[PDB]
Design a protein around this ligand. Structure first.
Ligand SMILES: CC[C@@H](N)C(=O)N1CCC[C@H]1C(=O)NCc1ccc(C(=N)N)cc1
Ligand code: NA
Ligand code: NA
Lengths: 250, 27, 10
């Protein structure tokens, strides 16, 4: 996260760290959506241009974290992967369209003050909240600039109108993406960055006061560049796929 | 069922330091 | 860079 702040304790208890076993290092962000399902970006797991193709046994899920590097005794929980599910039409070849994957844990995780699932949007919350100017919140342990933080970073960012998103890049944008970030003339700044990949873009619904994950950190051209915006997978647009997976594989 | 309600914030009726910025943008 | 984790998880 660039130009964000240290998270408060327990502020994002759905935050998941995807952790590489060997060598031991951050792989990506992710989010807890139930006691055994974790949501992330497909490119965290599969991205052939960079020879990235992780198997279940390559990875661990660390839940409940605050500190980036430290082992947080009596607080974090570390889980093994039972199975990865990547969207069958994830488009790694062109623009990262449908950049979404699910991970099923070997064993259910115990909720705690620091570990708790986020909600996924229904059509009405999505229609009400995904509007240009409405702010969401992005969290992650990724680069501080286009360097690595000691603790979880947080930044709030406004959704940007679709024509502005489109006009800010040569890449082809789809209905399965949205962009967010301040304009140059809005003065404020902030962005996700490398290492934030797979983490959540959340919004707090003013109707029921719950947090919903509207987006997944997916891609951006540089980080916190004037006239550029961060792009997020549109979670509601892919929920049919999410439910199907969760329904067929429980 | 309890999703999206944080133990150290919503469950205790405590607000974090910047969630009001989000509320104020929901115009 | 990262603190080693309990062997049980590896
Ligand atoms: C198409 C732009 C390229 N820079 C990119 O973002 N890619 C190449 C394929 C993987 C993805 C990536 O690195 N995602 C991580 C990332 C980068 C930037 C941002 C941001 N909001 N600035 C977020 C995540
Ligand atoms: Na364009
Ligand atoms: Na920008």
């Amino acid at each position: 996260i660039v130009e964000g702040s240290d998270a408060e304790i327990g502020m994002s208890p759905w935050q998941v760290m995807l952790f590489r076993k060997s060598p031991q290092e951050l792989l990506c962000g992710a989010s807890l959506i139930s006691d055994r399902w974790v949501l992330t970006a497909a490119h965290c797991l599969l991205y052939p241009p960079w020879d990235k193709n992780f198997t279940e046994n390559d990875l661990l899920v660390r839940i409940g974290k605050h500190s980036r590097t430290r082992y947080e005794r009596n607080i974090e929980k570390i889980s093994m992967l039972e199975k990865i599910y990547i969207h069958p039409r994830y488009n790694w070849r062109e623009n990262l369209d449908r950049d979404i994957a699910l991970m099923k844990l070997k064993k259910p995780v115990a909720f705690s003050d620091y570990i708790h699932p986020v909600c996924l949007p229904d059509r009405e919350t999505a229609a009400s909240l995904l509007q240009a100017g409405y702010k969401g919140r992005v969290t992650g342990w990724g680069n501080l600039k286009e360097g690595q933080p000691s603790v979880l970073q947080v930044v709030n960012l406004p959704i940007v109108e679709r024509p502005v998103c489109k006009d800010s890049t040569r890449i082809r944008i789809t209905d399965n993406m949205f962009c967010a970030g301040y304009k140059p003339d809005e003065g404020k700044r902030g962005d996700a960055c490398e290492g934030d990949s797979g983490g959540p873009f959340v919004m707090k619904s003013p109707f029921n006061n719950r947090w919903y994950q509207m987006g997944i950190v997916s891609w951006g051209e540089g980080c916190d560049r004037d006239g550029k915006y961060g792009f997020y997978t549109h979670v509601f647009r892919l929920k049919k796929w999410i439910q199907k997976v969760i329904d067929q594989f429980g | 069922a309890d999703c999206g309600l944080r133990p150290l914030f919503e469950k205790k009726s405590l607000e974090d330091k910047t969630e009001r910025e989000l509320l104020e943008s929901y115009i | 860079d990262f603190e080693e984790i309990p062997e049980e998880y590896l």
